[PDB]
Scaffold this motif. Structure first.
Motif, PDB file in Angstrom:
ATOM      1  N   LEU A  99      -0.124   8.700 -14.756  1.00  0.00           N
ATOM      2  CA  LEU A  99      -0.690   7.560 -14.042  1.00  0.00           C
ATOM      3  C   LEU A  99      -1.919   7.022 -14.801  1.00  0.00           C
ATOM      4  N   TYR A 105      -3.419   3.653 -13.836  1.00  0.00           N
ATOM      5  CA  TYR A 105      -4.156   3.053 -12.747  1.00  0.00           C
ATOM      6  C   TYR A 105      -3.168   2.377 -11.822  1.00  0.00           C
ATOM      7  N   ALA A 106      -3.572   2.187 -10.574  1.00  0.00           N
ATOM      8  CA  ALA A 106      -2.783   1.464  -9.578  1.00  0.00           C
ATOM      9  C   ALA A 106      -3.694   0.582  -8.790  1.00  0.00           C
ATOM     10  N   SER A 107      -3.271  -0.654  -8.541  1.00  0.00           N
ATOM     11  CA  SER A 107      -4.072  -1.603  -7.782  1.00  0.00           C
ATOM     12  C   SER A 107      -3.262  -2.346  -6.744  1.00  0.00           C
ATOM     13  N   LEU A 108      -3.953  -2.768  -5.695  1.00  0.00           N
ATOM     14  CA  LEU A 108      -3.406  -3.539  -4.610  1.00  0.00           C
ATOM     15  C   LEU A 108      -4.241  -4.797  -4.490  1.00  0.00           C
ATOM     16  N   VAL A 116       2.694   1.475  -3.526  1.00  0.00           N
ATOM     17  CA  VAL A 116       1.725   1.870  -4.548  1.00  0.00           C
ATOM     18  C   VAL A 116       1.382   3.365  -4.465  1.00  0.00           C
ATOM     19  N   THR A 117       1.206   3.902  -3.264  1.00  0.00           N
ATOM     20  CA  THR A 117       0.871   5.319  -3.009  1.00  0.00           C
ATOM     21  C   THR A 117       2.005   6.234  -3.448  1.00  0.00           C
ATOM     22  N   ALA A 119       0.850  -1.200   0.000  1.00  0.00           N
ATOM     23  CA  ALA A 119       0.000   0.000   0.000  1.00  0.00           C
ATOM     24  C   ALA A 119       0.891   1.258   0.000  1.00  0.00           C
TER      25      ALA A 119
END
Ligand SMILES: [Cl-]
Lengths: 183, 183, 184, 183, 183, 183
Positions: E163, E165-168, E150-151, E147
Motif C-alpha cells: 500500500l 496511499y489511499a484517499s477519499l 477504499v478500506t 469509504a
C-alpha cells in the motif's frame, strides 16, 4: 563416605608409575587405568575420602608438568565405584534408564544422585572417550524407580549444562539388552 | 483428533481482525489472544484438524508481511486444550512436575506426550513471553506417575534440542503450591 | 539482625524447585518469586542472617550453572522486608522522596541507610525490571526527615556510582500521591 | 480547543517530580503517568492549549538532560482525552475499526481526524510500548461511519509513513468484542 | 469466474508474436499489449480461467528465456477487466476513492476486493509504469460506499506491505473530476 | 533579577584590558579576574540580566577570536555573587553540605536552587581548576536546612548529568570545618 580420584597425565610411563605409587600410598582401588588419544594417560581411583585426597596429592605433586588434570569427587555412594570399574549385574529383563552427559564428573555426580534418590541398580558408568567427552550411566529396576532415577540424574547434569539426553526403556528388546546392561 | 493452531503477527490490528475471522469457522476455540512485547499479536486456536488447517491457512495468507510465524500441531490429547487456555484443576495436594522448554510448540508436544504416556493431570501449559520464548508445563499426581511424565516430556523436548530443565517436587511447600499449580 | 537473600536463575523450573527447597531449609520468608524477562527467575528471601545464609547456600550449590547471581545483604532494618514484598502503609499525606538507582542491591542498601538515618516511613522498594535494572525506593514523612532520608540514600548509591536521580516532593498533588505511595 | 502534552524522561524519580510540578503549574489533567522499558518514564497531560504549553515548558526546562522527548498536540477533539486515559463506553455491540500506527502522535492525530470526520465513538487509544512504539485506536459505530473513520485515520497516519495496518470488523464475535473495546 | 493473465517478455518482437498466438489459442481478450522501459514487453489478458490458464501456458512455454514473469489471477469480478483495458463510465459526479499500490497484482486484487465488498463503480486500474511499479485504482459512488471500498482495498494491499496511499474525495472539484475518472 | 557572565580568553593581555572596561562599568561587578592553565584568562561578572548581556556583547566584539567561551546565567539569587568572588562568612560550627559538579555553570545553577529552596548560608562556590572542571558549593546551617539545600542542589546538577557527589556533615570536626568553610 567414599570418594573418586581422577588423575590425567601427558605420559603413559608416568601414568603407570604414578598409578602404582598411588595404590601403595593408601587403601585405594584402581577403577580405570588407560591411554586416551592422542597419548594421554588416565587413572581413576576409589576409596575413603582421606585415602583418595592422599593418593591424589601424592600423584599431583610427583606429576609436575606431566599433569593434565586432577579431581576429587567426595560423598559418592559406594555402588558408584564398581559401576566405574566394571558392572553391577542385573538378573531379569527389567526397565533400563540411560543418562548421557558431557564429562565423567557430571556423569558420576548424576549417577550418585540417582542411587541415593531411588531404589535402582546402577549398572555401569561408561566413558565413550576421555574425561571431557560423552559419558553415560545405565540404571535398571522397576519402571517407576528407573523414571525417578532418570529424572534425578537429568536434573543433576542439567544444572551444570552438561545433560545430552536421557531415555527410559520399560522392557528392552533382547537384541539391545546386552549392549545396554553390559556394553 | 484435536489440533492446535498458532498464528503470530507483528500487527495488533491484524491480529484482532484475523482472530475474529478465524472464529467465523464453526467449532474453533480461541485458546489465547494476546499482545506480546513489544507489539506482536499471538493467536492460539483449538479444535478439529480440518478447521484449524483452514483457519491457519487463511490467517497466514491474509497476514502477509505482518505474519511472524504460523504452525499446526495435529493429534493433540483433548486435555491439552484447557491446559493452554487456563487450568485443569488439581483436587488433591500431590507431587508436581515442571518441564521447561524453548518454544510453545516443544512445550505442547512434550505436554501431549506426558498425558498420553502416564497417569498424571496436565495442570497448565504456560508461555512466559511469545511462541519462541521460555515455556513450561506443570503436571500433578503420584510421585511415580509424575516421574514418568517428566521423563517422557523431557525426551520429547530434548529430541528437538529445546529442553531447558525439568524438576520433580514430591511434596511442594504451602507457599510454592499456588504458584506452581495456578500461576 | 534481619537479612535479604537474592537468588537469580536462568530456569523457571529450577527457580520454583529451588524456591521450594530454600523455604524448607530454614525459617525464611518468600518476598519475591517471579519470572523476569527474557525468561530468568528471581527469588528474594527475608529472615535472620543465619537462616538467609543457609537458604542462599542451599540454593547456590543446587543451582550449578543455572545460577545467574546470588547475594546476601546483612544487617537490614526490619521495615525494608515488607517494602520489598509489598508496601508499608502511609499514616498521613506529607512529603515524599524518591531515590532511583541501578540494581536492587544499591536500592536496598540505600533504603536501609535512609530508614536508619531518619524518621521516615520506607513506603516501598520497586524493581522496574530485574535485579540489575532501574530500581527506586519511596519514602514519606515531614519535609525535613524526607530531605535527610534522600541525602543519606543518595550518598549510599552515589558512592558505588549507582545513583540515577533523587527527588523530594514536599506537597504531592492528589493525582501523583497514589502512584508514588502505592505504585498502581 | 483541547490539547495533549507529552513528556518522556530517562528517570522515574524525575518523572514523578516533574509530573507533580506540571499539575501544580496549570489546570491540566494527568492522562498517563507510567514507566516504559528500559526504565524511561512517560507523562501525558490533557487540558486547554495555554495550560498544556505552560506545563510542557515547565517540564522541559526543569528536565535538562533527563528529557528524552516532549510534544504538544493542539486542537484535539475533547473525546480523545478520556480515550487516552481509559475508555469511552460503547452504547451497543456494533462495527469496530482499528488503526495501528508507529508513534502515539500519529495515533492521536489519526484518532482526532476520525472523530471529527465521522459519527463514530472513539473507544480508546492504546500505546502498546512507549511514544515511538506501536499504538492503536479503536472506533465503534455503524459500518458506514466506521469505514469513513478508518479511511480518514489511515490517510492521516499514511501521510507520515506511520501507518502499520487498519481493519474494519463489521460484526465482531462475542469473544473478540471485549478485547477490542476494553483491552 | 473471470481471470487475468499477465505475460512479461524481454523482447518486443516475441511479445507481439506471443500476443498473437495467445489470442488464437483460446477465447481471451487482449487488455494490455505494450512496451515497458527499458525495452520489456507486457501482455495482459482477460477471460474465463480455463482459457486464461491455457493462453498463459502457451505463452510461457513458447517464451523460453525471453520470459521475465507470468501470472494468473483467478476469481476476478467481471468489471475489473474493462477497468484494466480502459474505463468503466461514471453515471454522475459523486465521491471518488483512489488506492495506490506497488505492483499491478496488488492493485488488481485490491480493486477486485473493493467491487465485491461495496456498491461502487470501479472506474479504472492504472499502471503508471510496469508490473512492479506504482499502480492505482479509482472508484466512484456515495461517500459511504467509497469509504468501504477504499478500506477493503487498503487492507488487501497493506497486508502485503504494498500500500502506498489511499484517499477519499467526497465532493471532487470540477477541475479534478476529469483527471481522476478519465486520466 | 541578578545574573552571572562568564568570559574565557586565550590572551591574558586581552583579558586584563577587558577586565578594565568591566571595572569601569558601574552596573557590572567583576567577581573573578584571573589566569587559568595553560594560559587562558577568566572573567566572571555579576549584574542584572541587561547589564550582563551587554557586557558579554562588549566582550565578544572587543575580544573577537580571543574569546574561548562566554556564558550568561540569568535569574541568579544575589547571595550567589559574593560566594563566587569570595566567601559569605560563617564562624560558629554548624551542619555543612557540599555539592560537587562538573562545570562552574552546573555549580552556580545548583547553588542558586539551594539558596532559593532553603534557609542555608551559601558559604562559597569553588572552581578547583577551570570552568569545565570540578566545582563545588559549600552550604551551612541547621541539619534540616542543609539536607534540603543538598537535595535541591543535587537534583539541579543531576538533571544535567553533571553531579559528581554530594555530602552532608551534621557535626563537622573542627580540623575539617576551616577547610570546608574557608578553603
Ligand atoms: Cl523377549
Amino acid at each position: 563416605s567414599q570418594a573418586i580420584g581422577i588423575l590425567e597425565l601427558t605420559s603413559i610411563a608416568a601414568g603407570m608409575e604414578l598409578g602404582d605409587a598411588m595404590l601403595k600410598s593408601a587403601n585405594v582401588d584402581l577403577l580405570v587405568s588407560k591411554t586416551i588419544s592422542p597419548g594421554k594417560f588416565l587413572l581413576m581411583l576409589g576409596g575413603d575420602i582421606g585415602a583418595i585426597q592422599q593418593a591424589i596429592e601424592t600423584g599431583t605433586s610427583q606429576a609436575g608438568e606431566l599433569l593434565v588434570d586432577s579431581l576429587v569427587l567426595a560423598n559418592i555412594h559406594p555402588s558408584v565405584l564398581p559401576a566405574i570399574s566394571g558392572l553391577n549385574s542385573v538378573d531379569k529383563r527389567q526397565a533400563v534408564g540411560i543418562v548421557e552427559t558431557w564429562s565423567v564428573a557430571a556423569c558420576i555426580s548424576a549417577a550418585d544422585r540417582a542411587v541415593k534418590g531411588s531404589n535402582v541398580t546402577l549398572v555401569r558408568v561408561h566413558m565413550a572417550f576421555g574425561i571431557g567427552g560423552k559419558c553415560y550411566m545405565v540404571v535398571a529396576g522397576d519402571v517407576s524407580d528407573v523414571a525417578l532415577a532418570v529424572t534425578v540424574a537429568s536434573s543433576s547434569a542439567g544444572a551444570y549444562g552438561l545433560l545430552v539426553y536421557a531415555s527410559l526403556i520399560p522392557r528392552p528388546h533382547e537384541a539391545m539388552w546386552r549392549q545396554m546392561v553390559e556394553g
